[PDB]
PDB file of N, CA, C and O in Angstrom:
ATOM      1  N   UNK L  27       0.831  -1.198   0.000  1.00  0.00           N
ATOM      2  CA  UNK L  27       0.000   0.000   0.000  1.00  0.00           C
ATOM      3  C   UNK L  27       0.870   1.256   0.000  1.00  0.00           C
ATOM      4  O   UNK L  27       1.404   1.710   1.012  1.00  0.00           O
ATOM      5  N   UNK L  28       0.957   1.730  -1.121  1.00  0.00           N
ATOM      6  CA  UNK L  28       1.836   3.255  -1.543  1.00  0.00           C
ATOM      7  C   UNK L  28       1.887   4.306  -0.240  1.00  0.00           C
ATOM      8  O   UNK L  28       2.795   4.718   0.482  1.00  0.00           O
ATOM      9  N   UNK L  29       0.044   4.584  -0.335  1.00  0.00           N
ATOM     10  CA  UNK L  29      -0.383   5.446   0.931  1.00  0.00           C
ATOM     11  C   UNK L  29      -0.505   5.380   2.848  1.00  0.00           C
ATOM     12  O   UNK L  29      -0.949   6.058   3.773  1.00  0.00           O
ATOM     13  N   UNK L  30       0.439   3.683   2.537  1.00  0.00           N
ATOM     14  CA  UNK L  30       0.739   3.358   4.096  1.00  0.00           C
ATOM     15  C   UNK L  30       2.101   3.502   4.070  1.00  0.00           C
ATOM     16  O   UNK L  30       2.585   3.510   5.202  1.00  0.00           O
ATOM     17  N   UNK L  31       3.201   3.664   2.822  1.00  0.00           N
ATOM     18  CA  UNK L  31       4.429   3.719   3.146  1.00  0.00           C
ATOM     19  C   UNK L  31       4.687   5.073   3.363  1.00  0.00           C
ATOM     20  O   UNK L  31       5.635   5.493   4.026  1.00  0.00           O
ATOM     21  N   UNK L  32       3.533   6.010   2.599  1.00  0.00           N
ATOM     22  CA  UNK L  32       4.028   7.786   2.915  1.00  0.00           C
ATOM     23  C   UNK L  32       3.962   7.714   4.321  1.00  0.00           C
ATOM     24  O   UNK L  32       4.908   8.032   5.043  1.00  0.00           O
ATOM     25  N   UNK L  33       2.449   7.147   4.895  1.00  0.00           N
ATOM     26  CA  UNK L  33       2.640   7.653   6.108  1.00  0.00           C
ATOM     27  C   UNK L  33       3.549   6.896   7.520  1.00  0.00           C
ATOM     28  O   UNK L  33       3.713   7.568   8.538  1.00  0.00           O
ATOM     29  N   UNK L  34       3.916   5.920   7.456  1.00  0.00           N
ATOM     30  CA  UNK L  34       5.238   5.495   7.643  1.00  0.00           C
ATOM     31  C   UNK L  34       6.203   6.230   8.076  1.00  0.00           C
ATOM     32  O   UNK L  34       6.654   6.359   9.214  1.00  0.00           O
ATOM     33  N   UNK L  35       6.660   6.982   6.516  1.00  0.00           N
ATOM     34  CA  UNK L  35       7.551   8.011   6.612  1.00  0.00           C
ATOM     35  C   UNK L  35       7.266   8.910   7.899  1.00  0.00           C
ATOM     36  O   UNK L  35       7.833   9.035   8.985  1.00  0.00           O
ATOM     37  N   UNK L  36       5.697   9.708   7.072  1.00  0.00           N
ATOM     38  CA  UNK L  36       5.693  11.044   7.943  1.00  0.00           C
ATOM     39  C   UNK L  36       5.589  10.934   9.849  1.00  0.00           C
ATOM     40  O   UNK L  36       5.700  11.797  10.719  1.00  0.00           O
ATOM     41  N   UNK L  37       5.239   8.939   9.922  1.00  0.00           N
ATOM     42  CA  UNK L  37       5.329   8.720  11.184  1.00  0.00           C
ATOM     43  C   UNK L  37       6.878   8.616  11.977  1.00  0.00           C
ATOM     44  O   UNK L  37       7.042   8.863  13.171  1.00  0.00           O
ATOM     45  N   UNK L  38       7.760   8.271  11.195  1.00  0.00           N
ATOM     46  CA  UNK L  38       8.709   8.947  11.916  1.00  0.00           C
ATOM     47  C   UNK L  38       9.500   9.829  11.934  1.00  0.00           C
ATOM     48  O   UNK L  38      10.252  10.074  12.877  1.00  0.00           O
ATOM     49  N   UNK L  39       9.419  10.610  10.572  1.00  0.00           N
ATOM     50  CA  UNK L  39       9.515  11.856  10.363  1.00  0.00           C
ATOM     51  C   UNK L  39       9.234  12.508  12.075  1.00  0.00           C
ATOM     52  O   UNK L  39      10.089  12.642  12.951  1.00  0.00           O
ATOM     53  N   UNK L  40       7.839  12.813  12.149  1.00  0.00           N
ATOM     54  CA  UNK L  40       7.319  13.286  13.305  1.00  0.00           C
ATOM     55  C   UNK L  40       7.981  12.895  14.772  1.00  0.00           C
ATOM     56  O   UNK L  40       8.052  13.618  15.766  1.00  0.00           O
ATOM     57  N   UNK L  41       8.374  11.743  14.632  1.00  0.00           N
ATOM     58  CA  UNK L  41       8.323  11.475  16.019  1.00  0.00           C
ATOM     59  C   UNK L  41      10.166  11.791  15.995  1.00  0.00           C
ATOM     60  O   UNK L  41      10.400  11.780  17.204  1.00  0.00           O
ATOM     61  N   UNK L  42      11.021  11.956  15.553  1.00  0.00           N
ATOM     62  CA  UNK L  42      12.193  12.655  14.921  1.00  0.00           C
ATOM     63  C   UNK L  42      12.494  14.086  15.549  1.00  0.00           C
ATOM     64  O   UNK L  42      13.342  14.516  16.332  1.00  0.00           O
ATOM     65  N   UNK L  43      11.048  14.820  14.615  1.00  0.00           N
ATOM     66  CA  UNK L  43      11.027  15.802  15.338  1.00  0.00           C
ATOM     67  C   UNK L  43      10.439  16.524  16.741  1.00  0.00           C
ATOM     68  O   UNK L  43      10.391  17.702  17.096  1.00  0.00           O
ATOM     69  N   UNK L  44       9.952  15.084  17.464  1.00  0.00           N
ATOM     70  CA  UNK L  44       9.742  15.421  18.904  1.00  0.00           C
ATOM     71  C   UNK L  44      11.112  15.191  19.527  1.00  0.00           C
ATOM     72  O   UNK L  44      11.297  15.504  20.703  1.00  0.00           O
ATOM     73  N   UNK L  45      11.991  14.705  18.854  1.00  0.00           N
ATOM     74  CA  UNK L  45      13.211  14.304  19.646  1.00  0.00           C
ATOM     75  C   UNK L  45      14.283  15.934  19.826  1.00  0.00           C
ATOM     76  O   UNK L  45      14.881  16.437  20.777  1.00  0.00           O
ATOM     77  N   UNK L  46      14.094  16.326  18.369  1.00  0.00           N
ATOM     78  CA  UNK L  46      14.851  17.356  18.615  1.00  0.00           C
ATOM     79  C   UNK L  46      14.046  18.323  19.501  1.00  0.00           C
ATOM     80  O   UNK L  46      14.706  18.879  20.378  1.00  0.00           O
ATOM     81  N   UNK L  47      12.781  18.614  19.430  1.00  0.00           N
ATOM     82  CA  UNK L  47      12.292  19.624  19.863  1.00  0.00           C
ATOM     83  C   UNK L  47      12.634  19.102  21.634  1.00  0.00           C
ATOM     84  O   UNK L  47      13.179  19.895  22.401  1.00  0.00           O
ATOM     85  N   UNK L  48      12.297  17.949  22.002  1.00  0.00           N
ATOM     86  CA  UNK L  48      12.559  17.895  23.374  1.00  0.00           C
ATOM     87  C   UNK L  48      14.563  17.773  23.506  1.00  0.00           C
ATOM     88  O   UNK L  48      15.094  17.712  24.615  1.00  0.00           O
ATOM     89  N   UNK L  49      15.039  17.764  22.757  1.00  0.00           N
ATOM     90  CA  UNK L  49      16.361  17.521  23.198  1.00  0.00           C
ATOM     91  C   UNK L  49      16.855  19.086  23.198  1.00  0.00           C
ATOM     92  O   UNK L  49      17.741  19.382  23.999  1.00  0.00           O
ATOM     93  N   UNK L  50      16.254  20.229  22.228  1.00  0.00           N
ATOM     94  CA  UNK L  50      16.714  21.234  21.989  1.00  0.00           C
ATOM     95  C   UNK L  50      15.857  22.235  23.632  1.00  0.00           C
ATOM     96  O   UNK L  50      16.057  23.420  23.900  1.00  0.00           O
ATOM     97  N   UNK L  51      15.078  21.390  24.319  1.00  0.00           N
ATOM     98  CA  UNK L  51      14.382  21.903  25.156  1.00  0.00           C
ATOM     99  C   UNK L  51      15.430  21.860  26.065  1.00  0.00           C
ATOM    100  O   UNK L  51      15.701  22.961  26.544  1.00  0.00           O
ATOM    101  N   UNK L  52      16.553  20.303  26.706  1.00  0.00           N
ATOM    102  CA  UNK L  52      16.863  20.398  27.557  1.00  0.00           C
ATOM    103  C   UNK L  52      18.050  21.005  27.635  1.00  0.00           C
ATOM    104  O   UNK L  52      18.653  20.912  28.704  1.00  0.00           O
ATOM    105  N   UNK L  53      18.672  21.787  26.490  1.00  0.00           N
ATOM    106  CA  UNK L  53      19.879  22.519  26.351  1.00  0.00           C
ATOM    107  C   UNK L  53      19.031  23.740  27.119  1.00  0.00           C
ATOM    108  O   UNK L  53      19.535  23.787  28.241  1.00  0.00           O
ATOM    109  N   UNK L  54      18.072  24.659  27.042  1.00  0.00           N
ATOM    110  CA  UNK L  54      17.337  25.776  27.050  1.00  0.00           C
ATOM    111  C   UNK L  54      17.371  25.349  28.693  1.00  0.00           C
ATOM    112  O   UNK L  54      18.180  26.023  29.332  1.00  0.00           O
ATOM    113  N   UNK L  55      16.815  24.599  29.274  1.00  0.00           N
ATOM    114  CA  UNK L  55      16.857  24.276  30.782  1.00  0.00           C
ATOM    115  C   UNK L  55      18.192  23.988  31.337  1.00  0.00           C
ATOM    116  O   UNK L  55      18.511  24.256  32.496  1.00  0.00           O
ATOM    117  N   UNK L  56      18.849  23.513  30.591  1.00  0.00           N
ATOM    118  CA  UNK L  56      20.506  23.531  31.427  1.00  0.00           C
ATOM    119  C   UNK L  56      20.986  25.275  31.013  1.00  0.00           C
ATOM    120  O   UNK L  56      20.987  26.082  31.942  1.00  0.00           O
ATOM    121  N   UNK L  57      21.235  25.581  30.106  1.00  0.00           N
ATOM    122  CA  UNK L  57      21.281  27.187  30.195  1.00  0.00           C
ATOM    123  C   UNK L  57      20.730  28.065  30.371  1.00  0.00           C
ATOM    124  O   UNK L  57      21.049  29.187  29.977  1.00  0.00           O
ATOM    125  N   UNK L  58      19.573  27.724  31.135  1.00  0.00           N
ATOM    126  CA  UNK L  58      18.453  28.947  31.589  1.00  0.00           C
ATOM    127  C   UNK L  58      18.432  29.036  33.076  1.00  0.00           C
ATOM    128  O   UNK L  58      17.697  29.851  33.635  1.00  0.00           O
ATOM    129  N   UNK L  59      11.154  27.019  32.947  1.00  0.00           N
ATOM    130  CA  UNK L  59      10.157  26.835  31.485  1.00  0.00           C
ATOM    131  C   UNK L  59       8.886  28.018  31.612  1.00  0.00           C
ATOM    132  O   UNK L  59       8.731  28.306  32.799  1.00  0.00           O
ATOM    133  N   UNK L  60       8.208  28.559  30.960  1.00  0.00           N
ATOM    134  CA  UNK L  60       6.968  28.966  31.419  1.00  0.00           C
ATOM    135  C   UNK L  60       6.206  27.505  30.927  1.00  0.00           C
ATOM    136  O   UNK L  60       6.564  26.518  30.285  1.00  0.00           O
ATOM    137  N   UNK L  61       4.807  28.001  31.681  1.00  0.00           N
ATOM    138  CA  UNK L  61       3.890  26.655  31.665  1.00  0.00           C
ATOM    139  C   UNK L  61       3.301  26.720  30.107  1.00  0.00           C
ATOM    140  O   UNK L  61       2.583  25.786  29.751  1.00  0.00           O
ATOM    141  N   UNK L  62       3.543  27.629  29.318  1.00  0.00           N
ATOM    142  CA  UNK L  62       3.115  27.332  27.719  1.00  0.00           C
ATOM    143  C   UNK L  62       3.744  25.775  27.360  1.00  0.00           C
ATOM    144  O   UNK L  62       3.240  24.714  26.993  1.00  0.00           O
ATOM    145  N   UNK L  63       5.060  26.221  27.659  1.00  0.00           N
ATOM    146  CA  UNK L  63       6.067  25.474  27.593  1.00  0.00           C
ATOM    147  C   UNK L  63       5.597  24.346  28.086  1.00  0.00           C
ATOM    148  O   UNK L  63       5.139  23.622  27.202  1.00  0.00           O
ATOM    149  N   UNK L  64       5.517  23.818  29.387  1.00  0.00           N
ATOM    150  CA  UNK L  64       5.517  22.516  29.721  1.00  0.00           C
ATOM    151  C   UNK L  64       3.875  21.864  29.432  1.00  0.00           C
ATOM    152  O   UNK L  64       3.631  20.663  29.319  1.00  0.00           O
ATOM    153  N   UNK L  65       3.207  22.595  29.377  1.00  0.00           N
ATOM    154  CA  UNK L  65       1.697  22.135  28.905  1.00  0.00           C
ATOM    155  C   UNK L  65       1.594  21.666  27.485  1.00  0.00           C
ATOM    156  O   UNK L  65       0.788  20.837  27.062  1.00  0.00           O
ATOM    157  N   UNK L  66       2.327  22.174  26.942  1.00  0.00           N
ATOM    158  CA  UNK L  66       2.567  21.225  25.156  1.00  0.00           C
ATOM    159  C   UNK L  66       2.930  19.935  25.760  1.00  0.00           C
ATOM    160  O   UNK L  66       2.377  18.849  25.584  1.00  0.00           O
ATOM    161  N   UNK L  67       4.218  20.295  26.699  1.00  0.00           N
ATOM    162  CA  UNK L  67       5.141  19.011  26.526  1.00  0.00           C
ATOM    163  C   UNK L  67       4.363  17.891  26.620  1.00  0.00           C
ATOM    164  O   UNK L  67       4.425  16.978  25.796  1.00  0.00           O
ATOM    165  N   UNK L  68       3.493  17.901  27.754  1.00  0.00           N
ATOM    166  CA  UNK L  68       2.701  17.078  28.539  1.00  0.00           C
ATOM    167  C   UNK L  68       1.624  16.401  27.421  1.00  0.00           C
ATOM    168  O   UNK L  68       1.377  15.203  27.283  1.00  0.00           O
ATOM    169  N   UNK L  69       1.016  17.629  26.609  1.00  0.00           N
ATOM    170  CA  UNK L  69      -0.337  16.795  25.584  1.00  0.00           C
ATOM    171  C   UNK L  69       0.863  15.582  24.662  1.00  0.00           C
ATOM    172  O   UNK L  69       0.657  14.370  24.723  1.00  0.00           O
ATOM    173  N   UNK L  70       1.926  16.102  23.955  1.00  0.00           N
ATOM    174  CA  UNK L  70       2.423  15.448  23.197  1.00  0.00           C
ATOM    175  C   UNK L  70       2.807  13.994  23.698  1.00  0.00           C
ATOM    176  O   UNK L  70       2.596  13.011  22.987  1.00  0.00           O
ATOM    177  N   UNK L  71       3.343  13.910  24.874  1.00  0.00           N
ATOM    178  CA  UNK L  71       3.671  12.533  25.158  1.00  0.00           C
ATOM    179  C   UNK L  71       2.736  11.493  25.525  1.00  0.00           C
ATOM    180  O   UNK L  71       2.909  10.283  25.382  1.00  0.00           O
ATOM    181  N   UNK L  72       1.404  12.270  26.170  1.00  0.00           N
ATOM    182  CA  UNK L  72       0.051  11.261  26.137  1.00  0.00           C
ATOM    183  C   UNK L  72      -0.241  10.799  24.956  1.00  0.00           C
ATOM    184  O   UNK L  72      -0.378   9.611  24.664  1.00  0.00           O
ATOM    185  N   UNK L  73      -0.333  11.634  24.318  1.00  0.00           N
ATOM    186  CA  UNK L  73      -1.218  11.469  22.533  1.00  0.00           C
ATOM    187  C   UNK L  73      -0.424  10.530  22.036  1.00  0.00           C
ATOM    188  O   UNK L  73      -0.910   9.470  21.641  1.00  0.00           O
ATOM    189  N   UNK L  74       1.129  10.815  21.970  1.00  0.00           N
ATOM    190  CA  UNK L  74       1.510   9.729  21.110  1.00  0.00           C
ATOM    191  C   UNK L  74       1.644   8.240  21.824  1.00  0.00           C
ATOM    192  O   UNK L  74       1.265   7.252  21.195  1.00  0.00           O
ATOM    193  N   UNK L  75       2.217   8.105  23.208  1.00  0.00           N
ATOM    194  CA  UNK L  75       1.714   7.040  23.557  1.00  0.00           C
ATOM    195  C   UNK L  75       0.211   6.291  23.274  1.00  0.00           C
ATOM    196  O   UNK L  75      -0.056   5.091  23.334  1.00  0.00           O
ATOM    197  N   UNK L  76      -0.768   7.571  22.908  1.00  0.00           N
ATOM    198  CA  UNK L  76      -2.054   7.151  23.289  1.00  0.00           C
ATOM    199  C   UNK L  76      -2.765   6.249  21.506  1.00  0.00           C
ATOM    200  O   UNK L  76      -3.646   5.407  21.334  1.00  0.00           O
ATOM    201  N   UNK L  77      -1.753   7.044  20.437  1.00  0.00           N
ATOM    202  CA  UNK L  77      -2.072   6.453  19.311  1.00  0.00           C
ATOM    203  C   UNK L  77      -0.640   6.052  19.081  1.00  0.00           C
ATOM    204  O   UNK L  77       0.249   6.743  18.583  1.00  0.00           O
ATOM    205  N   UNK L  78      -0.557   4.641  19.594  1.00  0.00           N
ATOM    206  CA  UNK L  78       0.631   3.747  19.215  1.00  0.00           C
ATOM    207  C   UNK L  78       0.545   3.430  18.110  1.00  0.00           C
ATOM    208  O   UNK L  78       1.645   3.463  17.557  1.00  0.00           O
ATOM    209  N   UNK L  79      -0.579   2.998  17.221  1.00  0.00           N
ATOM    210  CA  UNK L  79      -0.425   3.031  16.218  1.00  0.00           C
ATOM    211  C   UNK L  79      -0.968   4.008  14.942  1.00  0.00           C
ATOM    212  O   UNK L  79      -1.108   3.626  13.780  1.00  0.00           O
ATOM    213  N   UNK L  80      -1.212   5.243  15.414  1.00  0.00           N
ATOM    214  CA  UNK L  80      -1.604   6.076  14.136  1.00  0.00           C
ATOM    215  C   UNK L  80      -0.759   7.462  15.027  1.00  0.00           C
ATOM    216  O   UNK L  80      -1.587   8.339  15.272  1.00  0.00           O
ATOM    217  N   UNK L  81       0.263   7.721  15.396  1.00  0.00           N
ATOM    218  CA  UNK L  81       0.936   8.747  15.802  1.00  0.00           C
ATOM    219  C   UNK L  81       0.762  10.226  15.098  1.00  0.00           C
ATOM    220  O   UNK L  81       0.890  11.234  15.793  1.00  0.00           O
ATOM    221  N   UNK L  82       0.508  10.304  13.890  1.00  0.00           N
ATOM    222  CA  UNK L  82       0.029  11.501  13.207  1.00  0.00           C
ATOM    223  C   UNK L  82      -1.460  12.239  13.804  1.00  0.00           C
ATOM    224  O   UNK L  82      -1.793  13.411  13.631  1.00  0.00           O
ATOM    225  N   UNK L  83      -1.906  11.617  14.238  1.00  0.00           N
ATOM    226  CA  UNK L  83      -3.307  12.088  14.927  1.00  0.00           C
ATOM    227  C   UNK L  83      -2.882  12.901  15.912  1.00  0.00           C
ATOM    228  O   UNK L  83      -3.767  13.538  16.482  1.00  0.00           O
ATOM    229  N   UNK L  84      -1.413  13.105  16.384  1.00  0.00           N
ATOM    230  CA  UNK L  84      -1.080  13.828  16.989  1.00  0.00           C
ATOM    231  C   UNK L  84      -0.155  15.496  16.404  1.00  0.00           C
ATOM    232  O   UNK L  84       0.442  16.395  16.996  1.00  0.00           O
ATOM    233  N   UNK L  85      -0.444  15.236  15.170  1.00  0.00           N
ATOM    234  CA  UNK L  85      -0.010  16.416  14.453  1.00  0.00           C
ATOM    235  C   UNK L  85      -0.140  17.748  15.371  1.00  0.00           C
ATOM    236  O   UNK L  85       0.888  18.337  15.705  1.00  0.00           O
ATOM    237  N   UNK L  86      -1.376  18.200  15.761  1.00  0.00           N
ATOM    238  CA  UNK L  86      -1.212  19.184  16.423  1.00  0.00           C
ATOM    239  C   UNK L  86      -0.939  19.447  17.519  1.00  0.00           C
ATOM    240  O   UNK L  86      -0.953  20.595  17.964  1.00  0.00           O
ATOM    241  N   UNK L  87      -0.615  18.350  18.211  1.00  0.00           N
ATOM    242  CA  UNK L  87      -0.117  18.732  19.640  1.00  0.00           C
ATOM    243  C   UNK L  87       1.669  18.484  19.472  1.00  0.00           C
ATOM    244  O   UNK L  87       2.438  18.909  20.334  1.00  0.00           O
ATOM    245  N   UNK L  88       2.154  17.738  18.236  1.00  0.00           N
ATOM    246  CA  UNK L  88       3.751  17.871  17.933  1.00  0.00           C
ATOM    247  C   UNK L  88       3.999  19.268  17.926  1.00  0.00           C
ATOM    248  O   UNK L  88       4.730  19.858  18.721  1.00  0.00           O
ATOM    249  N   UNK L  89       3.169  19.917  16.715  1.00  0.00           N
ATOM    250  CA  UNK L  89       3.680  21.473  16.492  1.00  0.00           C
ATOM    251  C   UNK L  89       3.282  22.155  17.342  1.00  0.00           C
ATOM    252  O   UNK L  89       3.973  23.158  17.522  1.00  0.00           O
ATOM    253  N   UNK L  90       2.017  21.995  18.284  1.00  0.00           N
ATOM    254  CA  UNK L  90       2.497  23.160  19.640  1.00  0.00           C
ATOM    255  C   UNK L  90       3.212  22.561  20.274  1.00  0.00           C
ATOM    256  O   UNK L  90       2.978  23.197  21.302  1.00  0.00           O
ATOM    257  N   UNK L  91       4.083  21.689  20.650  1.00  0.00           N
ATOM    258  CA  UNK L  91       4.988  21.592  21.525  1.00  0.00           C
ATOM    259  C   UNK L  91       6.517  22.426  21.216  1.00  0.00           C
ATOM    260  O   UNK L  91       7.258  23.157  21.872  1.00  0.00           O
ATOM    261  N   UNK L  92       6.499  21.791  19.676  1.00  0.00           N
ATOM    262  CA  UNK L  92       7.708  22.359  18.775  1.00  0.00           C
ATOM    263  C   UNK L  92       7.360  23.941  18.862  1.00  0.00           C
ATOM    264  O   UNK L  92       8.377  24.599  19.084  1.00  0.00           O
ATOM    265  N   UNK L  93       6.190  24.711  18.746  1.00  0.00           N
ATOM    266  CA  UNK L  93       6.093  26.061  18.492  1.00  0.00           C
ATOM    267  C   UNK L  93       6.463  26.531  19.933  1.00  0.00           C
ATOM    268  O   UNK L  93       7.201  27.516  19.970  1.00  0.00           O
ATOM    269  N   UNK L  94       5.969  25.848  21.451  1.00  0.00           N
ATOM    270  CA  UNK L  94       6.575  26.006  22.454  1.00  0.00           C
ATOM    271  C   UNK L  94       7.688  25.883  22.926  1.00  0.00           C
ATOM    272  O   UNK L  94       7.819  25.935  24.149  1.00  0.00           O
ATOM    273  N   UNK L  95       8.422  25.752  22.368  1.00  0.00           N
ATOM    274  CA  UNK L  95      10.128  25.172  22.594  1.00  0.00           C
ATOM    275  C   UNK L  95      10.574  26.310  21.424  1.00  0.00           C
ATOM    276  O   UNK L  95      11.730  26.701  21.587  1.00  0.00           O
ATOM    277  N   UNK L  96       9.888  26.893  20.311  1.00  0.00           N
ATOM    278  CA  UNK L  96      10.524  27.898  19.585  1.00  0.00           C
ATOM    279  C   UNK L  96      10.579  29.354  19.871  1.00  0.00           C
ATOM    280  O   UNK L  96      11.174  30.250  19.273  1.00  0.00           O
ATOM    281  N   UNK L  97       9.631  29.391  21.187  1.00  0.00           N
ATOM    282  CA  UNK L  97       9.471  30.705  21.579  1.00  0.00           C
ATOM    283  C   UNK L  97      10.506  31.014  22.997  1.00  0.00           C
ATOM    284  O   UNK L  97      11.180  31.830  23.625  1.00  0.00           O
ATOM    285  N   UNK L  98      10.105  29.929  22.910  1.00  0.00           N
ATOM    286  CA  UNK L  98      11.088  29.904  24.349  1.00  0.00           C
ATOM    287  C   UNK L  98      12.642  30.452  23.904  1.00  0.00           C
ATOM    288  O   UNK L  98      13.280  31.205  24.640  1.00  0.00           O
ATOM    289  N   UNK L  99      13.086  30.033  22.779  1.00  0.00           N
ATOM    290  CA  UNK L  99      14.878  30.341  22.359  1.00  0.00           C
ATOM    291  C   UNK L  99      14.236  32.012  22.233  1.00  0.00           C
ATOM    292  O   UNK L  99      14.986  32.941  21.933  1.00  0.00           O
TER     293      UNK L  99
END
């Protein structure tokens, strides 16, 4: 199935970029959260635990976490 290998991709694509966004978080806490900040953190790691297998359903709580970790720099 073509349209299960894109999303494949974009599934770990995504989860990729929760790594940087939380790894680029804990540089910001060793050289420094407001609660914008940690209230993303929190939806993102339920959701994706919560869709083990369809992780994109969490699209919008990746990019507010990532948009919370971008305001913060």
């Amino acid at each position: 199935d073509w349209l299960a290998e894109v999303r494949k991709v974009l599934e770990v694509r995504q989860a990729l970029e929760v790594i940087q966004a939380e790894a680029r978080l804990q540089s910001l806490r060793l050289e420094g959260l407001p609660e914008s900040v940690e209230k993303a953190r929190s939806e993102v790691v339920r959701c994706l635990r919560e869709h083990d297998r369809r992780p994109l359903n969490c699209w919008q709580e990746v990019e507010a976490f990532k948009e919370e970790v971008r305001k913060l720099e």
